[PDB]
Design a binder for this molecule. Structure first.
Ligand SMILES: CCCCCCCCCCCCCCCCCC(=O)OC[C@H](CO[C@@H]1O[C@H](CO[C@H]2O[C@H](CO)[C@H](O)[C@H](O)[C@H]2O)[C@H](O)[C@H](O)[C@H]1O)OC(=O)CCCCCCCCCCCCCCCCC
Ligand code: CLA
Ligand code: CLA
Ligand code: CLA
Ligand code: CLA
Ligand code: CLA
Ligand code: CLA
Ligand code: CLA
Ligand SMILES: CCCCCCCCCCCCCCCCCC(=O)OC[C@H](CO[C@@H]1O[C@H](CO)[C@H](O)[C@H](O)[C@H]1O)OC(=O)CCCCCCCCCCCCCCCCC
Ligand SMILES: CC1=C(/C=C/C(C)=C/C=C/C(C)=C/C=C/C=C(C)/C=C/C=C(C)/C=C/C2=C(C)CCCC2(C)C)C(C)(C)CCC1
Ligand SMILES: [Cl-]
Lengths: 188, 148, 24, 490, 97, 449
C-alpha cells in the first residue's frame, strides 16, 4: 500500500477523450471511454475495443500477412472493398422477402459506400479510407456507420482498421470519438 | 448465406446527404447549424435563392389563385420562400448606411405586402388575393432592384 | 488437443476445476 | 366464547386430553406416511433405475424408506435393479401397512385418553390439582431419546443388528445399502462421510442418556425456574418450536447442499453439482483416461455409463423448476429413454467447439460455441441481417460419440442448431412426450421440494416461537394490562 | 407482399430475419413438430389480379376515372395459416398529364 | 407580531392570524408581489448573464427569455437573437420595481395600520360585505382587462410580436387583423380537450391569440364595471360561502386549473410558445425524427411511399385513422401535429408526397434535425436523452421544465382548493374545531343508516 497523496485541488491528467495506443506495428488513439472486448470477429484481430454503453459501437484492427508491398497493388479503391467485403458481415438470412421497404428483393441489409479517400502520413504510405452506412431491415440504431481504413506495413502485413458506430449514437457525439480514432490510425 | 451488397452512393454527400448531420452535432454554433453562417458567408448562394424566390412568386403563386388552391398558395409562400426574410437582410447588410435604410425600408414594405397577401389567401378572397399579389410583385422588384 | 480444464472453462466456467488453483 | 384461532387451548389445563390430542396428531402423521407410501408405490415405475430413478418420478417418501435399508417390494422389484427373491415383511408395502396399522392403534388410544382424561397420575399429591413435573418429564423423554439415538446408531446404522443406511460413490453410480463403521476422528464431521452419522448417534446417544439421567434427578434452580417459566406447559412449547425450526433449517440445508444423509441416487443431484461442473469434469476425466491409454473417440465415449451422463443434465438440476410446475420431473421434459450421444462441434477450419452451458439462473440462454481458449466462434444470432458468427457461415458440423447416434455426423445448419440448443442443457437425451403428455418445461426434484417445505416451515415456526415465547413471558398480561400501570414514566 | 416484414417478431420473439427461430420458453420441446410456425417464417410474396375499367374521360383537363375489381390473398401469418382470397371492388381516379 | 393564545393559530399557520387584519394582510400581499417581481427581475438578469449567442435559447435552460422573445424584443428572422439589451431592460425594471413593492409590503406589515377599516374607509373591507368584495373584484378585472390590452397594443401597434407562422419564416409580425369573430374566439372554449381539438392549446395562429385578448380585455373591463355597480344576486348568496378563506379557495381552484392549462399549453402549443425559443414540443420532436429518416433514405435511393415496414403499415408514410397521409412509426399518435417547418409540405389530403419527394427544402431539414436531437426528454440532473443514455449532453427542454413545474404547482393548488374550501365551508358552519360533544349530530340520527 504505497502512500501517494490524493489529488485535492489538482489539475486533471486527461480531458482529451482519447488514450494513445501502441500495438504491434501500428499506433492509434482509442476512444477513452471504450474498453477491450474478448471477441475475435475476424481472422487476424489484434485488438478490439467496444463501447461500455453498447457493443455496437466498437473498433477492430486486422493484420493479415500479404504478398504485396503497396496498397495500390490490391487494385483500385473500388476493387479493394469488394475483396474485403467480409468486414460488413454476412446476411445469415437466405430467406425470400419483398416486404421490408427500401431494399432490393431478398435483401434485408444494404451497405452504402458514402466516402472514399487516399490520404497518407509522414512516412509516405497511402491509406484507403472508407465511410459506409449499413442499413438493415429492422433498422437498428438507425443504421450503422462503418469507418474502414487499410494499409500494408513495412513487414508485408495488411493492417485494416474498422470503426463501427451505430447511427443513433453517431449524431449524439460518437462521431467525435470515431473520427478522432480514425484519423489517428498510423501504421509505422 | 450471401454477403451484403454495396451501392455507389459517394455522390449523395456532394448533393444533400451531410446536411442533417451538421444540424445535429452540438459542437458547432447554431448559426453554423441552422444554416445562418453559410448564408452570410457566401453572397451568391443568397443571390441564387432570392432570384429563385421570385421565380416561386412571380410565376408559381398566381397559378394557384385563379384555380383557388389556397393551402397550396399559403405554403407556396412559406416553403422555399421561408428563407426570404433572412436572405433579404443579408443582401441588405452589404450596403452603405444611407443605402441600407433605403434597402431595409423597401424590404419592410415588401414584408407588409406578403403578410397582406397571406391574409388575403387566408379568407379565400380571390378578388383580393389576385390584387394583393400584383402589389406584392411590385414591392418584390423594388427590393431586388436595391439589394442586387 | 484440449485439457479437461480448458474444456470445462468454455462450457461452464464456474467449474470446481476451473476455480481452484487459478492463481496462474 | 373463544375465537376460532383459540379453540385448541382447552387442552392447556388438563394433561389427559393433551395425551389424546397428540395421539390424534400422531395417528394422522403416520396415517399420512403409510397413505403416501401406498400412493407412491401405486405410481412408481421400477423398470429403469438407471435412467428413470425414484427422484425422477416425483417419489417423495420412497427415498426415505430406501435411505434406511428398505430396498425391496412385494411386486418382485428392487431399487438396485434386480428381483427380490424374499421381500420379507419390511417391504415398501409392509411399511406402508405398518404405518396404517399404527395409525388405527394410535387412533383408538386417543379415544381412550379423551374419555379417561381424569387420571390420578395427572394430579400431583397433596394439592390435588392437575400438575406436570416438566423438568423430570423432560428427563424421562430425553432419556428415551438418547436410548433410541444410541440404538439407531450402534445397531441400525452400523449394521450390528439392523440393515444400515444408503452409501454410494462420489458420482452416484454404485450405490447400495450397506453397514458403515463409525469414524471417531476429525473425519466424522465431514457430512459427506456416512461414518460420521453412525459416530454421531452413538456419541449423541450416549450423551443424551447421560443428560437424561441428569434431568431425571437434579431439580432445576429456583432462579432458573421463574426466568424460564418452567411451571407452564407453554414454555416447553416455545422452546420445542425453537428446537424444530433450528432442526428444519439444518435438515433443509443439508438436503439442498447435499450430505451423506441425502444421497443423489435417492434425491437427485444438487444445484451446486451442475454449477461447479461436478459430473462434467468426471465425464472428461474418463474420456481423457481412455484417450491417453490409446483409444478412439467413439470407443471412449461408449465406456461412460449412461447413468453418469444423466446427472450431467440441466433438467435434473433441482433449481431448474417452478413453484406451480407441479409433479414429477418426467412430467416436464419426458421420461428419459436413451442417451443420444456426445455432441462434438467442429467448424470449417478444423477447430473444436464447446457449447457454453445454460447457467442455473437462466430460463432462456443464447447458444454460444466457444473454442479451446474460451473465445466465441459461433452462435445462433438473434439478428441474422448482417451476422459474423452464424453457424451457417462458420460451418459448424456436429458429430456424436457413444449413445444412440454413435459415429453419425450432422452438417445441416437447421439440424446443428437443434443439437446446439440441446447441448447447452447438458448431455443429449431422447425423451417421450407422449407417455405422460409432458409440458416441455422442467420441474424440480424432491430435493428441491423438500427444501421448499422445510424452509417455509422453519420460517413460519420462527413466528410460532415468537408467539409462544411471548405468551409465556407475558402470560399475566394476555387479557390486557392493569389500570394503574402509569408508574413506568418519569 | 408478405403482410408482415421479415423482421417482424411474433409474441414469442421469433421471426424471419430477427428472432430466436424456436420456442425458447419450452426448452425441452424447443424444436419439434411445431416447425411450421417457429422454424421458417415464410415471407414469400404472392400475386393478385385486378381489372380496371375506364368509365369517364375529361380530356380538357386530362382526368380519367372508373371502377376497379381486384382479387388478392389475405395473409399467411408469416407462413402459419392458409391465405384467403379477398375480392375488392370500388372506384378509382387519375390525372393524365 | 402576534402569538398563539391571542389568536388560536400556531406558528405554522400564522399567516391565518391576519385574516381579519386588513392592513397587515395588504402588506402580506404587496411584499409577496415584490417577490414575484423580484424573481422575475433576478432570474431575467441571471438568464441574460448566462445567455450565450452561439447556442439555442432552449438549450441554455432559459424559460423567461423565450417569453420576452415571443413578444419580439431582440429577435430576428428564424429566431436569431439580434441583441440582448431588451432582455436586460426587462430584468432591471422588475428588479427596481421589486424594491418599491418590497418597501410598501414591509411598510404595511410593520408600520402601517393593522386594520384599515376605520381610518381609510375606501380600502377597508369586511369579508362578509358582498358589495365591497365585488367592488375589489371589479377593480382588479379592469387591471387584468387593461393588462390584456397591453398585449394587443404591443402586437398591433408597438412593434408587433413574434409570429412563427409568418410567410418567409418566423419573425416579428405586426398583427394588423386580429380575429374578433365570436364564433372563432368562443369556438376554442367549447371545443373538446382531446386529440385533434386540444381545447384552447391548439390556437394555431397569432391572429386568434391577439383577437382573443381583445375579447378577454373588453369582457374584463365590462365585467369589472359590472361588479363595481352590482352586488351578488340572491341565488349567489345561496350558493357561496362568504368568508375570506372561501374567497381564497375559490381562487385556488381557479388557479389550479390554470396551472394545468399552462402545463398542457407549453407542452403542446408551438404558436404562443414558439419552437425557436422553447424548443420542439413532444409531438414536434417525434415527427421530426420520422421526417429526418425520410429525407436520409430518399437520398440513399428508396421509395419512402412504397417502403413497407416490418408490421406492414408503412415505414415512412402511412394513413391516419381519418385518412390523412401521415408519418409512420410510433409517431402515428402525433399525426395531428402541425409545425411551421412541416406545413409547407402538407396539402389537403394529409402530407403531399409529390411535394415531399421533390420540394423538401434545405432549411426544413436543418430545423427538423435540430428538433430531433433536442427532444423534450432529459433527466432530473439534466442529462438529455432517454433513461438509457450516457452523460454526453447537458439538456432538458424548457417545455419539459415548464410543464412539469406547472403540473406540480397546479396539482398542489387543487389540493389547496380542497383544503380551504372544505375548511371555509366547515368553519362558516361552526364545526371546524370539532364535534361539539354535547349535541353530536350522529347521535340524533336513525341507526342502520
Ligand atoms: C371533458 C373534461 C376533460 C378533462 C381533461 C381531459 C384531458 C384530455 C387531454 O388529452 O388533454 C390534453 C389537452 C391538450 O390536447 C392536445 O392539444 C394539441 C394541440 O396541438 C395542436 O395545435 C397546436 C397549435 O399551435 C400546435 O400547432 C400542434 O402542432 C398541434 O398538434 C393536439 O391537438 C393534441 O392532439 C391534443 O391531445 O390539454 C388541454 O386541452 C388543456 C386541458 C387541461 C388538461 C388538464 C390535465 C390535468 C388534469 C388534472 C389531473 C390531476 C388531478 C388531480 C386530482 C387530485
Ligand atoms: C417405532 C416405530 C416406527 C418405525 C420403526 C418407523 C420407521 C420409518 N418411518 Mg415412521 N412413524 C412412526 C413410527 C415409526 N416409523 C410414527 C409413530 C409416526 C408418526 C409421528 C411416523 C411418521 C412417519 C413419517 C411422516 C415418515 C416416516 C418414515 C419412516 C421411515 C424412515 C424414517 C426416517 O428417515 O426418519 C428420519 C427420522 C429422523 C431424522 C429423526 C428426527 C429426530 C430429531 C433429529 C431428534 C431431535 C430431538 C431429539 C430429542 C434431540 C435430543 C437428542 C439427544 C440429545 C438425546 C422408516 C421406514 C418416512 C417414510 O418414508 O415413510 C413413508 C416418513 O416420511 N414415519
Ligand atoms: C413438506 C411436505 C411435502 C413435500 C415436500 C412433498 C413433495 C412432493 N409431493 Mg407430496 N404430499 C404431501 C406433502 C409433501 N409432498 C402431503 C401432505 C400430501 C397429502 C395431500 C401430499 C400428496 C401428494 C400427491 C398426491 C402428489 C404429491 C406430489 C409431490 C411432488 C410434487 C410437488 C408438487 O407438485 O408441489 C406442488 C406445490 C405447489 C402447488 C405449491 C404450494 C404453495 C401453497 C401451499 C399453495 C397454497 C395457496 C392457496 C392457499 C391454495 C388455494 C388455491 C386453490 C385453488 C387450491 C413432490 C415430490 C406429486 C407427485 O409427484 O407424486 C408422484 C403427487 O401426485 N404429493
Ligand atoms: C408445534 C406447533 C404448535 C402448537 C402445538 C401450537 C399450539 C397452539 N397455538 Mg400456535 N403457532 C404455531 C405452532 C404451534 N402452535 C406456529 C408455527 C405459528 C405461526 C403461524 C403459530 C401461531 C399462533 C397464533 C398466532 C396463535 C396460536 C395459538 C395456539 C393455540 C391454539 C391453536 C388453535 O386453536 O388453532 C386453531 C386453528 C384452526 C381452527 C384452524 C387452523 C387452520 C390453518 C390454516 C392450518 C391448516 C391445518 C393444516 C391441515 C395442518 C398443517 C400444519 C403443518 C404445520 C403441518 C395452541 C396452544 C393461539 C393462542 O395462543 O391462543 C391463545 C393464537 O392466537 N399459534
Ligand atoms: C411571502 C411570505 C410571507 C409574508 C409576506 C408574511 C407576512 C407577515 N406575516 Mg407571515 N409567515 C410566513 C410567510 C410570510 N409572512 C411563513 C412562511 C411563516 C411560517 C414560518 C409565517 C408565520 C407567521 C406567523 C407565525 C406570524 C406571521 C405574521 C406576519 C405579519 C407580521 C410580520 C411581523 O410582525 O414580522 C416582524 C418581523 C420582522 C420585522 C423581522 C424582519 C423581517 C423583515 C420584514 C424582512 C424584510 C427584508 C427585506 C429585504 C426588506 C426590503 C425593504 C425594501 C425597502 C426594499 C406579516 C404581514 C404575524 C401576524 O399574523 O401578524 C398579526 C404572525 O404572528 N407570519
Ligand atoms: C416554477 C418555475 C420554474 C421553472 C420551470 C424552472 C426551470 C428551470 N430553472 Mg429555475 N428557478 C425557479 C423556478 C423555476 N425554474 C425558482 C423559484 C428559482 C429561485 C430559487 C429558480 C432559480 C434558478 C437558478 C438559479 C437556476 C435555475 C435553472 C433552471 C433550469 C434547470 C433547473 C434544474 O436543474 O432543476 C433541478 C431540479 C430540482 C431542483 C427539483 C426541484 C424540486 C423542489 C426542490 C421540491 C423538492 C420537494 C421537497 C420535499 C420539498 C422541500 C421542502 C421540505 C424539505 C420541507 C430550468 C430551466 C438553472 C439554469 O438553467 O440556469 C440557466 C439555474 O442555474 N433556476
Ligand atoms: C376573476 C373573474 C371573475 C370572478 C371571480 C367573478 C365572480 C362572480 N361573478 Mg362575474 N364576471 C366576470 C368575471 C368574474 N366574476 C367577467 C369578466 C364578466 C363579464 C363576462 C362577468 C359577468 C358577470 C355577470 C353578468 C354576473 C357575474 C356574477 C358573478 C358571481 C357568481 C358567478 C358564478 O357563480 O358563476 C357560476 C357559473 C355558472 C353557473 C355557469 C356554468 C359554468 C359551466 C362550467 C359551463 C360554462 C360554459 C362557458 C361557456 C365556459 C366554457 C369553458 C369552461 C369549461 C372553461 C361572482 C361574484 C353574477 C352575479 O351575481 O353578479 C352580480 C352575474 O349575474 N359575473
Ligand atoms: C395562494 C395560496 C394560498 C394562500 C394565501 C394560503 C393561505 C393560508 N393557508 Mg393554505 N394552502 C395552499 C395555498 C394557500 N394558502 C395550498 C396550495 C395548500 C396545499 C399544499 C395549502 C394547505 C394549507 C394547510 C394544510 C393549511 C393552510 C393554512 C393556511 C393559512 C396560514 C398558512 C401559513 O401561515 O403558512 C405557514 C407556512 C409554512 C408552515 C411553511 C410551509 C412550507 C411548505 C413545506 C412548502 C415549502 C415550499 C416548497 C419549495 C414547495 C415544494 C413543492 C413543489 C414541488 C411544488 C393561510 C390562511 C393553514 C390554516 O390555518 O388553515 C386555515 C393550514 O393548516 N394551507
Ligand atoms: C380436507 C381436504 C381439502 C382441503 C383443501 C384442499 C385444497 C388446499 C390447498 C391446496 C394447495 C395445493 C394444491 C395443489 C394443486 C395441484 O395442482 O396439485 C397437483 C399435484 C399433482 O401434480 C401432478 O402429479 C402427477 C404425478 O403424480 C403428474 O406429474 C401431473 O402432471 C401433475 O399435475 O398435487 C400435489 O403436488 C400436492 C403436493 C402438496 C405438497 C407440495 C409441497 C408443499 C411444500 C410447501 C409447504 C408450505 C407452503 C407454504 C405455506 C405458507
Ligand atoms: C381404524 C383402524 C384401522 C384403519 C386405519 C386407517 C384406515 C387409517 C387411515 C389414516 C389416513 C388415511 C390418514 C390420512 C391422513 C392424511 C393427512 C393427515 C393429510 C394431511 C394433509 C395436509 C396436512 C396438507 C397440508 C398442506 C396443504 C394444505 C396444501 C399443500 C401444503 C401443505 C403440505 C402445508 C384398521 C382397519 C387398520 C385396523 C385398526 C383400526
Ligand atoms: Cl418510430
Amino acid at each position: 500500500a504505497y502512500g501517494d497523496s490524493a489529488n485535492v485541488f489538482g489539475k486533471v491528467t486527461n480531458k482529451s477523450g482519447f488514450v494513445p495506443y501502441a500495438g504491434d506495428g501500428f499506433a492509434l488513439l482509442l476512444p477513452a471511454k471504450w474498453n477491450p472486448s474478448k471477441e475475435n470477429d475476424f481472422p487476424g484481430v489484434i485488438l478490439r475495443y467496444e463501447d461500455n454503453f453498447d457493443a455496437v459501437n466498437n473498433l477492430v484492427v486486422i493484420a493479415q500477412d500479404t504478398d504485396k508491398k503497396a496498397i495500390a497493388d490490391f487494385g483500385s479503391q473500388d476493387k479493394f472493398l469488394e475483396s474485403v467485403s467480409y468486414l460488413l458481415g454476412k446476411q445469415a438470412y437466405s430467406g425470400e422477402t419483398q416486404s421490408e421497404g427500401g431494399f432490393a428483393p431478398n435483401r434485408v441489409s444494404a451497405a452504402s459506400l458514402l466516402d472514399v479517400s487516399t490520404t497518407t502520413d509522414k512516412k509516405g504510405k497511402t491509406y484507403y479510407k472508407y465511410e459506409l452506412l449499413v442499413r438493415s431491415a429492422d433498422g437498428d440504431e438507425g443504421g450503422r456507420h462503418q469507418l474502414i481504413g487499410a494499409t500494408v506495413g513495412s513487414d508485408n502485413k495488411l493492417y485494416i482498421i474498422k470503426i463501427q458506430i451505430g447511427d443513433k449514437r453517431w449524431f449524439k457525439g460518437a462521431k467525435k470519438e470515431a473520427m478522432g480514432a480514425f484519423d489517428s490510425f498510423t501504421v509505422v | 448465406l450471401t454477403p451484403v451488397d454495396l451501392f455507389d452512393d459517394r455522390s449523395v454527400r456532394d448533393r444533400g446527404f451531410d446536411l442533417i448531420y451538421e444540424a445535429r452535432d452540438l459542437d458547432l454554433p447554431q448559426n453554423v447549424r441552422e444554416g445562418f453562417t453559410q448564408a452570410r458567408a457566401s453572397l451568391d448562394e443568397t443571390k441564387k435563392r432570392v432570384k429563385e424566390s421570385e421565380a416561386r412568386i412571380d410565376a408559381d403563386l398566381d397559378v394557384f389563385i385563379q384555380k383557388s388552391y389556397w393551402t397550396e398558395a399559403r405554403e407556396q409562400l412559406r416553403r422555399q420562400v421561408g428563407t426570404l426574410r433572412f436572405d433579404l437582410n443579408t443582401l441588405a447588410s452589404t450596403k452603405e448606411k444611407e443605402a441600407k435604410k433605403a434597402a431595409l425600408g423597401l424590404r419592410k414594405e415588401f414584408i407588409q405586402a406578403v403578410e397582406d397577401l397571406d391574409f388575403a389567401l387566408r379568407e379565400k378572397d380571390q378578388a383580393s388575393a389576385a390584387k394583393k399579389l400584383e402589389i406584392t410583385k411590385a414591392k418584390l422588384d423594388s427590393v431586388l432592384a436595391a439589394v442586387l | 488437443v484440449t485439457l479437461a480444464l480448458d474444456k470445462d472453462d468454455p462450457a461452464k466456467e464456474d467449474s470446481v476445476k476451473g476455480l481452484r488453483k487459478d492463481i496462474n | 366464547g373463544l375465537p376460532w384461532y383459540r379453540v385448541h387451548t382447552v387442552v392447556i389445563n388438563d394433561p389427559g386430553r393433551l395425551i389424546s390430542v397428540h395421539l390424534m396428531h400422531t395417528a394422522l402423521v403416520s396415517g399420512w406416511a403409510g397413505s403416501m407410501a401406498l400412493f407412491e408405490i401405486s405410481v412408481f415405475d421400477p423398470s429403469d433405475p438407471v435412467l428413470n430413478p425414484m427422484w425422477r418420478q416425483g417419489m417423495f417418501v420412497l427415498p426415505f424408506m430406501t435411505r434406511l435399508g428398505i430396498t425391496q417390494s412385494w411386486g418382485g422389484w428392487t431399487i438396485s435393479g434386480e428381483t427380490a427373491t424374499n421381500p420379507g415383511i419390511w417391504s415398501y408395502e409392509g411399511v406402508a401397512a405398518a404405518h396404517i396399522i399404527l395409525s388405527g392403534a394410535l387412533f383408538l388410544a386417543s379415544v381412550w385418553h379423551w374419555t379417561y382424561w381424569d387420571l390420578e397420575l395427572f394430579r400431583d399429591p397433596r394439592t390435588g390439582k392437575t400438575a406436570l413435573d416438566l423438568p423430570k418429564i423432560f428427563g424421562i423423554h430425553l432419556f428415551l431419546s438418547g436410548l433410541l439415538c444410541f440404538g439407531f446408531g450402534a445397531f441400525h446404522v452400523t449394521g450390528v443388528f439392523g440393515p444400515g443406511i444408503w452409501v454410494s460413490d462420489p458420482y452416484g453410480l454404485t450405490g447400495r445399502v450397506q453397514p458403515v463403521a463409525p469414524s471417531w476422528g476429525a473425519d466424522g464431521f465431514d457430512p459427506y462421510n456416512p461414518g460420521g452419522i453412525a459416530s454421531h448417534h452413538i456419541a449423541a446417544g450416549i450423551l443424551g442418556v447421560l443428560a437424561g439421567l441428569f434431568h431425571l434427578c437434579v431439580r432445576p434452580s429456583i432462579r432458573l425456574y421463574f426466568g424460564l417459566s418452567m411451571g407452564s406447559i407453554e414454555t416447553v412449547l416455545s422452546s420445542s418450536i425453537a428446537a424444530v425450526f433450528w432442526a428444519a433449517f439444518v435438515v433443509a440445508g443439508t438436503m439442498w447442499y447435499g450430505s451423506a444423509a441425502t444421497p443423489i441416487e435417492l434425491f437427485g443431484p444438487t444445484r451446486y453439482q451442475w454449477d461447479q461442473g461436478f459430473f462434467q469434469q468426471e465425464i472428461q476425466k474418463r474420456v481423457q483416461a481412455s484417450l491417453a491409454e490409446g483409444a478412439s473417440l467413439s470407443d471412449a465415449w461408449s465406456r461412460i455409463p449412461e447413468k453418469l451422463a444423466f446427472y450431467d443434465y440441466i433438467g435434473n438440476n433441482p433449481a431448474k423448476g417452478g413453484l406451480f410446475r407441479t409433479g414429477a420431473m418426467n412430467s416436464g421434459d419426458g421420461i428419459a429413454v436413451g442417451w443420444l450421444g456426445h455432441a462434438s462441434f467442429k467448424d470449417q477450419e478444423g477447430r473444436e467447439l464447446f457449447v457454453r452451458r445454460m447457467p442455473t439462473f437462466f430460463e432462456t440462454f443464447p447458444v454460444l460455441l466457444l473454442d479451446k481458449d474460451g473465445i466465441v466462434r459461433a452462435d445462433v444470432p438473434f439478428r441474422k441481417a448482417e451476422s459474423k458468427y452464424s453457424i451457417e457461415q462458420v460451418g459448424v458440423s456436429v458429430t456424436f460419440y457413444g449413445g444412440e447416434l454413435d459415429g453419425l455426423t450432422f452438417t445441416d445448419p437447421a439440424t446443428v442448431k437443434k443439437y446446439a440448443r440441446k447441448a447447452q442443457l447438458g448431455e443429449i437425451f431422447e425423451f417421450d412426450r407422449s407417455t405422460l403428455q409432458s409440458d416441455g418445461v422442467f420441474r424440480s426434484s424432491p430435493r428441491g421440494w423438500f427444501t421448499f417445505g422445510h424452509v417455509c416451515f422453519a420460517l413460519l415456526f420462527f413466528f410460532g416461537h415468537i408467539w409462544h415465547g411471548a405468551r409465556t413471558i407475558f402470560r399475566d398480561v394476555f387479557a390486557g394490562i392493569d389500570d394503574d400501570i402509569n408508574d413506568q414514566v418519569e | 407482399p408478405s403482410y408482415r416484414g421479415s423482421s417482424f417478431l411474433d409474441p414469442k420473439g421469433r421471426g424471419g430475419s430477427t428472432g430466436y427461430d424456436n420456442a425458447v420458453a419450452l426448452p425441452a420441446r424447443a424444436d419439434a413438430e411445431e416447425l411450421l410456425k417457429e422454424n421458417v417464417k415464410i415471407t414469400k410474396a404472392l400475386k393478385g389480379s385486378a381489372v380496371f375499367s375506364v368509365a369517364k374521360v375529361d380530356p380538357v383537363t386530362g382526368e380519367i376515372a372508373g371502377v376497379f375489381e381486384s382479387i388478392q390473398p389475405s395473409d399467411t401469418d408469416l407462413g402459419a395459416k392458409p391465405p384467403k382470397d379477398i375480392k375488392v371492388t370500388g372506384l378509382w381516379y387519375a390525372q393524365l398529364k | 407580531g402576534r402569538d398563539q393564545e391571542t389568536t388560536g393559530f400556531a406558528w405554522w399557520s400564522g399567516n391565518a392570524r391576519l385574516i381579519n387584519l386588513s392592513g397587515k394582510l395588504l402588506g402580506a400581499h404587496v411584499a409577496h408581489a415584490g417577490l414575484i417581481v423580484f424573481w422575475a427581475g433576478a432570474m431575467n438578469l441571471f438568464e441574460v448573464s448566462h445567455f450565450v449567442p452561439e447556442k439555442p435559447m432552449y438549450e441554455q435552460g432559459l424559460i423567461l427569455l423565450p417569453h420576452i422573445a415571443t413578444l419580439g424584443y431582440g429577435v430576428g428572422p428564424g429566431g436569431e437573437i439580434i441583441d440582448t439589451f431588451p432582455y436586460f431592460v426587462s430584468g432591471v425594471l422588475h428588479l427596481i420595481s421589486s424594491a418599491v413593492l418590497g418597501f410598501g409590503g414591509v411598510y404595511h406589515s410593520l408600520i402601517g395600520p393593522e386594520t384599515l377599516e376605520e381610518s381609510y374607509p375606501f380600502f377597508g373591507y369586511v369579508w362578509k360585505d358582498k358589495n365591497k368584495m365585488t367592488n375589489i373584484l371589479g377593480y382588479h378585472l379592469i387591471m387584468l382587462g387593461l393588462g390584456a390590452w397591453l398585449l394587443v397594443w404591443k402586437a398591433m401597434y408597438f412593434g408587433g410580436v413574434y409570429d412563427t407562422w409568418a410567410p418567409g419564416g418566423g419573425d416579428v409580425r405586426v398583427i394588423t387583423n386580429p380575429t374578433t369573430n365570436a364564433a372563432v374566439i368562443f369556438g376554442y372554449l367549447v371545443k373538446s380537450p382531446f386529440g385533434g381539438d386540444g381545447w384552447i392549446c391548439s390556437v394555431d395562429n397569432m391572429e386568434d391569440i391577439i383577437g382573443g385578448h381583445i375579447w378577454i380585455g373588453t369582457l374584463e373591463i365590462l365585467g369589472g364595471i359590472w361588479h363595481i355597480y352590482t352586488t351578488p344576486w340572491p341565488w349567489a348568496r345561496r350558493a357561496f360561502v362568504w368568508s375570506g378563506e372561501a374567497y381564497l379557495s375559490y381562487s385556488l381552484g381557479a388557479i389550479g386549473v390554470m396551472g394545468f392549462i399552462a402545463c398542457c399549453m407549453s407542452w403542446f402549443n408551438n404558436t404562443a410558445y414558439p419552437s425557436e425559443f422553447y424548443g420542439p414540443t413532444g409531438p414536434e420532436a417525434s415527427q421530426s425524427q420520422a421526417f429526418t429518416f425520410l429525407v436520409r433514405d430518399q437520398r440513399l435511393g428508396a421509395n419512402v411511399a412504397s417502403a413497407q415496414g416490418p408490421t406492414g403499415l408503412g415505414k415512412y408514410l402511412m394513413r391516419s385513422p381519418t385518412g390523412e397521409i401521415i408519418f409512420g412509426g410510433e409517431t402515428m399518435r402525433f399525426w395531428d401535429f402541425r409545425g411551421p417547418w412541416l406545413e409547407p409540405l402538407r396539402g389537403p389530403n394529409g402530407l403531399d408526397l409529390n411535394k415531399l419527394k421533390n420540394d423538401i427544402q434545405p432549411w426544413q431539414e436543418r430545423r427538423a434535425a435540430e428538433y430531433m436531437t433536442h427532444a423534450p426528454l432529459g433527466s432530473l440532473n439534466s442529462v438529455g436523452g432517454v433513461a438509457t443514455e450516457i452523460n454526453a449532453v447537458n439538456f432538458v427542454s424548457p417545455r419539459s421544465w415548464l410543464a412539469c413545474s406547472h403540473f406540480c404547482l397546479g396539482f398542489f393548488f387543487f389540493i389547496g382548493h380542497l383544503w380551504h374550501a372544505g375548511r371555509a365551508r366547515a368553519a362558516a358552519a361552526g364545526f371546524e374545531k370539532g364535534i361539539d360533544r354535547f349535541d353530536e349530530p350522529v347521535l340524533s340520527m336513525r341507526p342502520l343508516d
